[PDB]
Design a binder for this molecule. Sequence first.
Ligand SMILES: O=C(O)[C@@H]1CCCN(C(=O)c2ccnc3[nH]ccc23)C1
Length: 167
Amino acid sequence: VNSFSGYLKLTDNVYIKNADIVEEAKKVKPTVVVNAANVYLKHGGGVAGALNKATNNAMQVESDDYIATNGPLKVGGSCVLSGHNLAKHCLHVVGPNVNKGEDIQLLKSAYENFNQHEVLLAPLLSAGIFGADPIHSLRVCVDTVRTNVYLAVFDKNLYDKLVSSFL
Ligand SMILES: O=C(O)[C@@H]1CCCN(C(=O)c2ccnc3[nH]ccc23)C1
């Protein structure tokens, strides 16, 4: 038993809710919240900008030190940093950005990072401003992640489309 509430169960291990991931993180305080990161951990907009704003820019300060030490992430890669006031940990995961021409096949590699964590609160990778089809992202999620994932979809219209079209 865990504290996630109001989710629709899609599969054995994948759950979905129309929710603001920032507000969901603030209430649940999950062990892991996933950020829709880029390779530079520049949290300017989308999910990343919202998560970072909710940390009062502490996420960005920590991220800048991480990059100064380690260099950029790989597309499809991840790193574990603090969850600040939102979660114990933040798993920064880089899905491919279609608006930059990155290979969509890397979306499966991106979701594989979730398997290193027993339970996660997450957005749909490569959705939103990353330009992928969220229905495809949900399919890859279901077919790749084996650990327990609670997906938060900000847009109610999109949420209904994702549920109604789910196979
Ligand atoms: O989900 C939607 O409707 C939008 C379009 C797809 C990408 N988005 C998210 O992944 C998301 C989900 C939940 N809270 C969020 N806060 C900021 C982004 C965000 C936003």
